[PDB]
């Protein structure tokens with residue numbers, strides 16, 4: 369049973385996952401995903417969420433006063449506050465497993481140059497805060513990363529949704545001049561396992577030598 | 581100018597392309613295609629059990645082949661998100677940012693029949709890529725990540741970044757580091773350099789050539 373709150377200036381972006389949820393898991397009270405528009409907590413008529421960085425430079429920084437108010441309302445001491453950022457600790461499958469047993473995740477989607485650092489610093493004095501990167505590239509905002517995180521975590525929550533894996537094949541046995549490797553149709557399951565292991569080894573060497 | 585086609589059995593999940601990415605400026609067109617449009621069955625069965633055994637289902641090559649025949653040309657870069665792919669990094673995003681035509685094929689279940697990629701590679705460039713070391717249910721979220729990463733680099737649109745600050749200079753008894761308020765560019769550049777190095781060592785030692793925790 370997990371509650372996920374997402375805070376973003378683009379709430380419509382998160383509507384796919386809101387619809388990716390089986391009705392059964394919602395009605396069983398296994399999962400709830402709520403999305404909140406950050407501008408609800410702006411306090412000027414122009415609904416400002418960012419401002420120029422101290423120390424100069426191009427880019428805008430999201431205002432601590434706005435985020436502070438939002439997190440104050442949404443978070444509790446039990447919350448795991450997740451902040452996607454290219455400067456974060458690596459988000460991996462191990463991370464997803466760990467977070468899959470959390471009761472309350474709040475994902476704070478930043479944009480532009482990022483969120484004023486005091487927001488996370490302040491939050492960290494009364495809840496668990498995790499700045500995480502989903503990969504070594506740069507996006508415009510945290511929303512796509514939030515989708516990845518939500519999907520990776522929730523698919524590990526029962527009933528809600530190393531080497532590289534080798535190739536897989538299904539019907540038909542012959543297609544556009546290409547046959548399924550005959551070993552897979554051999555009925556020798558020890559030999560099939562060894563073939564797949566070697567395929568995995570070769571693919572890992574070729575594509576991800578870092579994993580060795 | 582760039583064209584992006586995404587092919588998926590869940591085209592509704594790709595609606596978030598029309599939010600912060602834009603298209604509206606006409607520098608790029610993005611189209612989403614329902615893979616089931618290329619089935620001939622009354623049940624539209626896109627998957628079956630894997631040869632050689634194993635859990636789950638594999639997407640049949642027949643439906644993908646027909647779809648890609650219609651959508652791709654020899655100039656197409658066929659992108660296939662997969663946890664078993666080459667790593668997609670910022671370098672990749674730069675490389676793809678000058679392409680005319682990306683087609684992103686989103687898999688589901690336990691994957692796509694290997695022959696789809698093998699067949700496509702006889703006529704176009706194919707890139708199987710991972711966006712990170714975690715497992716998703718399907719390629720669609722990875723497609724969105726790839727699209728975002730690439731589009732912000734399209735003409736007409738290391739270390740970890742350290743902390744950023746903005747007004748007010750004091751908040752909840754927390755002050756902006758005084759050097760940032762000082763207007764001294766050399767001292768500010770140096771402080772920021774030191775913060776980034778400190779953050780990179782702590783969070784991503786691998787980037788500086790050290791063992792990971």
Ligand SMILES: COC(=O)COc1cccc(COC(=O)c2cn[nH]c2)c1
Pocket residue numbers: 451452453454477478479480481482483484485488499500501502503504505506507508509510511513
């Ligand atoms: C204190 O927290 C923050 O400042 C975070 O704010 C930002 C700043 C820049 C970019 C993003 C979006 O996340 C990614 O691009 C990302 C995640 N993983 N890999 C790339 C978010």
Ligand SMILES: COC(=O)COc1cccc(COC(=O)c2cn[nH]c2)c1
Pocket residue numbers: 660661662663686687688689690691692693694697708709710711712713714715716717718719720722
């Ligand atoms: C030949 O290509 C395929 O078989 C594609 O198959 C699948 C199957 C399930 C899920 C996905 C989506 O990719 C990721 O989860 C992913 C990407 N990066 N890191 C994780 C793709």
